[PDB]
Design a protein around this ligand. Structure first.
Ligand SMILES: [K+]
Ligand SMILES: [K+]
Ligand SMILES: [K+]
Ligand SMILES: [K+]
Ligand SMILES: [K+]
Ligand SMILES: [K+]
Ligand SMILES: [K+]
Ligand SMILES: [K+]
Ligand SMILES: [Mg+2]
Ligand SMILES: [Mg+2]
Ligand SMILES: [Mg+2]
Ligand SMILES: [Mg+2]
Ligand SMILES: [Mg+2]
Ligand SMILES: [Mg+2]
Ligand SMILES: [Mg+2]
Ligand SMILES: [Mg+2]
Ligand SMILES: [Mg+2]
Ligand SMILES: [Mg+2]
Ligand SMILES: [Mg+2]
Ligand SMILES: [Mg+2]
Ligand SMILES: [Mg+2]
Ligand SMILES: [Mg+2]
Ligand SMILES: [Mg+2]
Ligand SMILES: [Mg+2]
Lengths: 53, 216, 15, 119, 251, 68
RNA sequence: CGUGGGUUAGUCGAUCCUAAGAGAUGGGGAAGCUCCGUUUCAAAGGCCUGAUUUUAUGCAGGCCACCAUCGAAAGGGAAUC
RNA sequence: AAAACAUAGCAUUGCGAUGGUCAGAAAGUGAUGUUGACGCAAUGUGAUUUCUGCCCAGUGCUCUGAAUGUCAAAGUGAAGA
RNA sequence: UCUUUACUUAUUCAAUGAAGCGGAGCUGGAAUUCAUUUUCCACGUUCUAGCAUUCAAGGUCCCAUUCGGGGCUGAUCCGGG
């Protein structure tokens, strides 16, 4: 129950990873892939714009 | 230097969170600030009748400086000086005359040699009649940036008017030179100023709107 | 963790 | 003019003086409204109250209706020079308050009751 | 006589709207700098039923331009918008279903919905399920788009007034018969106390202009003047004509 | 004294001078609360003929009421 | 009928929270008893941290600003056998 | 306790918010409305099937219809001290 | 007398935590130096359910270098409608 989360140690409430007790493992994996790929495509977006100039 | 890097923010639409800018122009001020600002506006947007509009012209800074120079020589006795004078009980005093009822009475008797009228009296009807009256009685008058300034001349907070009836023979020529200057800007212009309506000034944005229709 | 608990730890160290 | 990063104007912080009165609010401070002699009105000496003295090591008092458990503990320690373990209280059907005061094991309720002088 | 049913409604006691389960008022974002000058992108996080309303709602999340935080709007979902879709709102947003454009910035023939009557009203026209407005013309001198409303009224609005591209979802709702009294009961349970309705002729004279008589009948014309007063306006108010419409109603 | 002139001016309520002051002031008063303390009399001549003096203990309030 | 005895809580309830709702204030109505409205066309507050070691207030900094309050002994809710 | 009311179904009417219907003594006031014509409001008929004729003189409702009939207060003209 | 139409400050409506209005620029783009600049158009975000906060890094100038601090610019100017 909500207030019982106050009595228990941090290992019961989390897991050892980015977004531990907040997002699931496959959700974190999609966030990482998407962050990596969109941030790369941004470098390509700018270069393609900078060539046309 | 090698550890440090240039990471410039893009504050275009839909990019970074905008930085803290000066929003003074947009502040929702307290109602009383709004009232006092909008009152100043409204009283220039409306066509202002001559008897009021004449108070827009005021004595220039150099002449005003020279006037206050003179009048400061005839400051009324302070509370301390009176306490001294009454132990002695003395010579004739020369002092700036003030009090709206007093001065109005002095002007009607042609005792005043120079009258100063504050430009910022509220309500205005305390002094709208004075230029006309001084003009009628042949009294030199100046409209001066004051109330508070004339206050200081007379050991008061404010004063509304101040006048000289007598000056010392030292400063007779000083007064006369000063009256000549003062007459040029007020009494000698009185009959022209009596005809000219003030106000009808547009705000910034409406002016621009008017200027863009003028050239077309 | 709640503010009241954070404040407790902060007092404990201030001694 | 000064820079204003918010478009909200708030009331300025302004000095707040403490009161410095020209005369006291009242002449004389009231004496303690609930001293020990007010907190403990009298012992309760029903046959069932007395059974608790003899057995449970519990004194049973009538007690001011304004008195809480902290004030009863403090009054009992003061008036009878005894150590209190716990206080249980109830408001009786006649509208007075009864306190069941258990002493610590070092004291005997029957001795102390004999001293205050109801057996 | 006594105060009739249609007059009791204005006091709004038992006749107020039943709003416990509603999601919030559907409204466009407040019209701000970004929307006036560029566009802002939001995400469709959820598409959700609103009690009382036919059309589903779309919870669209946008970043705040001036503070680090998110801002959930509640849009009425256009047919075809899906969870995860990005929505673009502003002067410069592209002409795709779900985007929010000023009506000046769209060609003649565009279908829009949740259109503002005045700029920044946050949405007014064509919000019920299956409805939309058609842009039919621009007047760029007067800065006025002309539009056809669901009713078939034509209307001139500011070209700065915004709309959403496409038709409100949940269309064809009123093609399924209700069949049972009970279905109408549950329909009106989430709206307001308007149902069931006693006919005025089944009442006594004290209760309604139509009441009374040794047969149920109206007894005077049922068409009532526009200048009639409260307590008299029952029947057909200010009717230009009456009887079965032999033809098409479109202009 | 001034107060004689003030008395006579205030009788000319459709003079251009007084029309203008009437317009500015009616606006300003409409902006404040329906009852509000006035700092000083707007008509000091009128106030004094009705009994006001400029002493500590005399107070002016301005109030509007609905017509009709 | 007369006279007495009898109800013991950190853990059970109330107390806290919000519901439909009720309702001050800012304001506006009303001759007025009062009416409207509940975040408004208001200058509407109160936290954090270090200290200073002067003292638990001004000072040092920062920080955020929504809008009283009442409304459940069956709703939500810290803890006992 | 019914053959009455409701009902789904059918049909009509009003209204695009500076709005319709309705509330309030008033209001910087309210309900519909957390609404927007697949909606809100006002009526009639009463599942399905089948059909729903003729009459716009009357009463009503309604009309970017003619005008010089009727026609208040204010205003205007003449007479008159 | 009517119809059409200007002005903005009264009055009226609406919105927001009163955040980017109005006028000039800068920058380009196209067009067109038709000698000459007159203008006109834009003036950082659109494969993707990621991320975006600490007076901003940078640049630059002062400070008295030190743990740092301050200004300017980055983010054009003007009018506080
Ligand atoms: K009902
Ligand atoms: K019915
Ligand atoms: K009838
Ligand atoms: K308890
Ligand atoms: K409870
Ligand atoms: K019918
Ligand atoms: K007929
Ligand atoms: K007829
Ligand atoms: Mg108890
Ligand atoms: Mg029906
Ligand atoms: Mg009957
Ligand atoms: Mg009747
Ligand atoms: Mg019958
Ligand atoms: Mg009738
Ligand atoms: Mg005073
Ligand atoms: Mg008994
Ligand atoms: Mg419990
Ligand atoms: Mg109330
Ligand atoms: Mg409560
Ligand atoms: Mg419970
Ligand atoms: Mg029976
Ligand atoms: Mg029936
Ligand atoms: Mg049938
Ligand atoms: Mg007449």
């Amino acid at each position: 129950r909500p207030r019982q989360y106050a009595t228990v140690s941090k290992t019961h409430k989390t897991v050892s990873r980015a977004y531990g007790g907040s997002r699931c493992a496959n959700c974190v994996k999609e966030r990482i892939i998407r962050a990596f790929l969109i941030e790369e495509q941004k470098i390509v977006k700018k270069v393609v714009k900078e060539q046309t100039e | 230097n090698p550890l440090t890097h240039s990471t410039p923010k893009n504050f275009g639409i839909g990019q970074a969170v905008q930085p803290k800018r000066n929003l003074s122009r947009y502040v929702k001020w307290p109602e009383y600030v709004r009232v006092q600002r909008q009152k100043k506006i409204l009283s220039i947007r409306l066509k202002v009748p001559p008897t009021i509009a004449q108070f827009q012209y005021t004595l220039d800074r150099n002449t005003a400086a020279e006037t206050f120079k003179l009048f400061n020589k005839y400051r009324p006795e302070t509370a301390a000086e009176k306490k001294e004078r009454l132990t002695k009980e003395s010579p004739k005093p020369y002092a700036v005359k003030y009090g709206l009822n007093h001065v109005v009475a002095l002007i009607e008797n042609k005792k005043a040699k120079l009258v100063l009228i504050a430009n910022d009296v509220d309500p205005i009807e305390l002094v709208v009649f004075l230029p006309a009256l001084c003009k009628k009685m042949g009294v030199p008058y100046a409209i001066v940036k004051g109330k508070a300034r004339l206050g200081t001349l007379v050991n008061q907070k404010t004063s509304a008017v101040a006048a000289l009836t007598e000056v010392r023979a030292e400063d007779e020529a000083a007064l006369a030179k000063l009256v000549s200057t003062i007459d040029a800007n007020f009494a000698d212009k009185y009959d022209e100023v009596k005809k000219h309506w003030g106000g009808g000034i547009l705000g910034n944005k409406a002016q621009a709107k008017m200027d863009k229709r003028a050239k077309n | 963790m709640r503010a009241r608990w954070r404040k407790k730890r902060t007092r404990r160290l201030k001694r | 003019l000064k820079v204003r990063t918010s478009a909200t104007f708030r009331l300025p912080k302004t000095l707040k003086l403490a009161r410095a009165p020209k005369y006291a609010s009242k002449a004389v401070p009231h004496y303690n409204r609930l001293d020990s002699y007010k907190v403990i009105e009298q012992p309760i000496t029903s046959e069932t109250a007395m059974k608790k003295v003899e057995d449970g090591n519990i004194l049973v008092f009538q007690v001011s209706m304004k008195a809480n458990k902290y004030q009863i503990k403090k009054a009992v320690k003061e008036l009878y020079e005894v150590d209190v373990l716990k206080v249980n209280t109830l408001v009786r059907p006649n509208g007075t308050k009864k306190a069941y005061v258990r002493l610590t094991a070092d004291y005997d309720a029957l001795d102390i009751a004999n001293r205050i002088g109801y057996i | 006589g006594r105060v009739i049913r249609n007059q009791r409604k204005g006091a709004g006691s038992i006749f107020t709207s039943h709003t416990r389960l509603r999601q919030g008022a559907a409204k466009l974002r407040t019209l701000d700098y970004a929307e006036r000058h560029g566009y802002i992108r939001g995400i469709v996080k959820q598409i959700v039923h609103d009690s009382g309303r036919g059309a589903p709602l779309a919870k669209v999340v946008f970043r705040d331009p001036y503070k680090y935080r998110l801002r959930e709007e509640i849009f009425i979902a256009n047919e075809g918008v899906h969870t995860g879709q990005f929505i673009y709102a502003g002067k410069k947003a592209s002409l795709n279903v779900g985007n929010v454009l000023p009506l000046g910035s769209v060609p003649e023939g565009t279908i829009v919905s949740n259109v503002e009557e005045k700029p920044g009203d946050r949405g007014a026209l064509a919000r019920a399920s299956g409805n939309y407005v058609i842009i039919i013309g621009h007047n760029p001198d007067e800065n006025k788009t002309r539009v056809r409303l669901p009713s078939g009224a034509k209307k001139v609005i500011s070209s700065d007034a915004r709309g959403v591209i496409g038709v409100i979802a949940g269309g064809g709702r009123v093609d399924k018969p209700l069949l049972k009294a009970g279905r109408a009961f549950h329909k009106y349970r989430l709206k307001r106390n308007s149902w069931p309705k006693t006919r005025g002729v089944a009442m006594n004279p004290v209760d309604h202009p139509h009441g009374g008589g040794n047969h149920q009948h109206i007894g005077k014309a049922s068409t009532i003047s526009r200048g009639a007063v409260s307590g008299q306006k029952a029947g057909l108010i200010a009717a230009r004509r009456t009887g079965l419409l032999r033809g098409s109603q479109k202009t | 004294g001034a107060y004689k002139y003030l008395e006579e001016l205030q009788r000319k309520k459709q003079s251009d001078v007084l029309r203008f002051l009437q317009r500015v002031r009616v606006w300003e008063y409409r902006q404040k609360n329906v009852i509000h303390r006035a700092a000083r009399p707007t008509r000091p001549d009128k106030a004094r003929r009705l009994g006001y003096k400029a002493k500590q203990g005399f107070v002016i309030y301005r109030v509007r009421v609905r017509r009709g």
